[model samples]
Target: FEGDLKWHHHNITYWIQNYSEDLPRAVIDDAFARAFALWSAVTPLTFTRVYSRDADIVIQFGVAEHGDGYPFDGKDGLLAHAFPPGPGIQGDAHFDDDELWSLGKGQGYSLFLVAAHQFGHALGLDHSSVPEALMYPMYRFTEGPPLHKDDVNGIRHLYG
Candidate 1:
């Protein structure tokens, strides 16, 4: 999909910033970068944070009912969501911080994990029906792994 995007833009940068004061800036930055890298590694999309308003995309991590129609419920049930390609908040990504979003919590979810999945959504990819897919709505943890071949192939197939 590198040369073919059902909907996408050209030479646009995205902004990602920390919303949680308790969450270390470095952690937020790392997670956001990792999330963006996940898609960029497979597509032609290039992202930066020069200016959010000027940016074509914006990524934010936060808690329940974070202001979108998608009202995230606390502690499970949709860890995050993203808007697909379009205008005005298009390509935006959000994570539900209401949950114990820390792998170290002994029972919390991983930030990088969900962020990567949300990135797929923001890039105009739908939830993969495949259980092995990264976009599989179900939450599963796989550290430092490339996206599922099917999911990667899907992204590349849609917007490379």
Candidate 2:
């Protein structure tokens, strides 16, 4: 896990930039919005992709301990993880670039699938015992949609 809490807020909006053309920008942005909405809908907090200049949140997909202390173990060990909300590292979400983030079921863990789960961490959510919940620490490649009620309540508990 990352050393400790570094960032702690999500009042800002990060942009949708594709580091690689591996995934369509449209799908990437959609995943990002849906993930953020999972948290915002539960609280007064709001997010926008247009406000990229000084975004309080930046979603990035990559490998190793580039910066955040949470070093990705590649392929299957840990798909992704995010920093808890605070400052600097707060609201930033990271995914393992080593993973093959696919568009549909299986084949590979969907980017949206992993991002949604990791976003929960960025928002200060702990692991959920409910395996069906998005906040579950493990990866569910077949999981559908974003933010179930349990997810909403988790983020709300932090922001609201």
Candidate 3:
């Protein structure tokens, strides 16, 4: 199950349980949609928004030690994390509420960027050695299309 981690189906559903107070819910929702679109743009996989508790992916924001064992260290350390594709808590992404989330190019971590990275993991992608890859472990803010060729190639390898 860990070797080729991917959803058996193409249509994936996601839910946003909690939101960040640093930004508006609309902004957060939009960011999440855009992040999903980044993957859908290059892969055959399609994503749908759902409000039910049985979504394929669940997203939320929380403070330090917000369960799931992987706790946030407030602000700069450990921005967020996600589980690989599977049942139960798998495919869920959680952001640290202690970190300052921003939509603009202001002084804070970009929600879109972090979400894009976490979504990469939610889709069973591991860290890439290439720094340009969105699946890279480090967080680097960039504008425009976030997916590098490496990312596209990786997703295509899985979804195709």
Candidate 4:
């Protein structure tokens, strides 16, 4: 964690640059859409999707060395990562295809869960010490408790 960084503008544009085979395109899209919605639900920030245009956030799935210097270790540790808000690679979310991604599978990693956490970084917050928080480094997931109070406090501190 470098530092807390946030977009200068509240209206953030994001683009799903690539798709993963583990989930259908529509389902993948829905997962991301919902992830963005979670953040928007709490703060003044708004996320917009744009096709083939300049975007504030770019989402993709890749294996080892996707050309950004950050390579995936394959199937085990380090599922995905995102850059904090800034220019260029900042705000981009990269998923390591080595891991199996699922919805509310109640087993494998939930795309919505990880995506929402990654967006927290893209927005400006770091991992929360509270394990129950969405910003916690664990793969915590549940339909009921979407985010912990610590996450809300951190995000609100930045953009609320």
Candidate 5:
């Protein structure tokens, strides 16, 4: 595994460029907040919402070839991707608009679940092979513990 990669600062800011039609703006916002909370609860890291494009984490929704070189392969191929902490483009996450984002588990794909995974990458955590991990490469919807034991330990290893 690569060495620890994490933000030097505790307080971070994120921006939402736009919202998806799959869910209302309020639901999307809450889901993002909850996703961020999943990390904040374990570490000293805190996330603030900024309306501007210039932010630590700039979140966006797009379809195939929406830019960023890494073109999404439509539906189930690639759900989203995020860059590790850094300057321009770093920490930014792009969600594939081709998939139907939902609030409820098994409804389609839960926005909260996907965003939590992307946020892990944004914060510099790599995917875990363990299926219980939120950072697992494969996506699944769940109402149970969002962060796996490995996830909590990993972030603590970085931020603690």
Candidate 6:
């Protein structure tokens, strides 16, 4: 759906502005790194972690009214949201801090899972109608590989 809305470069820069205290720093870093890798692995895309706010994709934890016009609806059904790639807040992702973020299977919402899904949006991909897809509009946690066949096909076509 976002055919013309994708990033124009192979090397993408990202920054995690804020993190959930529920998980250790390294765990958060590792989760996000792995999350981005899910996409970069199948495409010509590559990701680099930056320490500044300026990035192709800026990630942060927020609740209620953050910086953007989109105010999160607490910890309810709203887990996270991200913008399509462009400039400034365009490719940014905001997660509701109200949710208990974790890497544990079934303990809480997995940051790795959500970050992978959100990054799909940040890369100009739409939510997949297929329930098993990583790009599916609603969230689902899995210990398996983050990408499904549909996700792989979509992103491959996206970056090609």
What are the per-residue Cα lDDT tens digits for candidate 4 across 1-160?
Answer: 6345788799999999989898999999999999999889999999899885379898989999998988999986898999999987998999988888898565678899899989998898888888788998887658776788999999889886
| Residue-wise C-alpha lDDT for candidate 6, range 23-89, written one tens digit per residue | 9999999999998988887899999999987889999999889978889887668899999989999
Lowest lDDT sum, 10 consecutive residues, model 1, at 1-10
Off by over 4 Å in 5: 1-3
Worst 10 residues of 4 by lDDT: 1-10
Better of 2 and 4 by lDDT: 4
In model 3, the Cα lDDT at residue 125 comes to 87
Name the better of 2 and 3 by lDDT.
3
Q: Which candidate ranks first by TM-score, i.e. highest?
A: 3
**Candidate 6 segments whose C-alpha is farther than 4 A from its true place:** 1-3
By TM-score, the better pick of 2 and 3 is 3
Residue 96: error of model 1 in Å? 1.3
Error of 5 at 136 (Å): 1.4
116: Cα error in model 5, Å: 0.3
Off by over 4 Å in 1: 1-7, 103-105, 144-146
TM-score for each of the candidates: 0.83, 0.80, 0.95, 0.93, 0.94, 0.94
lDDT of every model, 2 decimals: 0.72, 0.69, 0.89, 0.88, 0.89, 0.88
Off by over 4 Å in 2: 1-10, 17-20, 51-53, 143-148
| Model 3 ranges off by over 4 Å | none
**Cα lDDT, model 4, residue 4:** 53
- Residue pairs with colliding backbones in model 4 are none
Q: 144, model 5: CA deviation in Å? A: 0.9
**lDDT (tens digit, per residue) of candidate 1 on 1-160:** 2542345564557776446553677786787777778778778867665545656667776776676777888878877788887776677778777766664346678777888887777777888888878888888876557488888888777765
Clashing pairs in 5: none
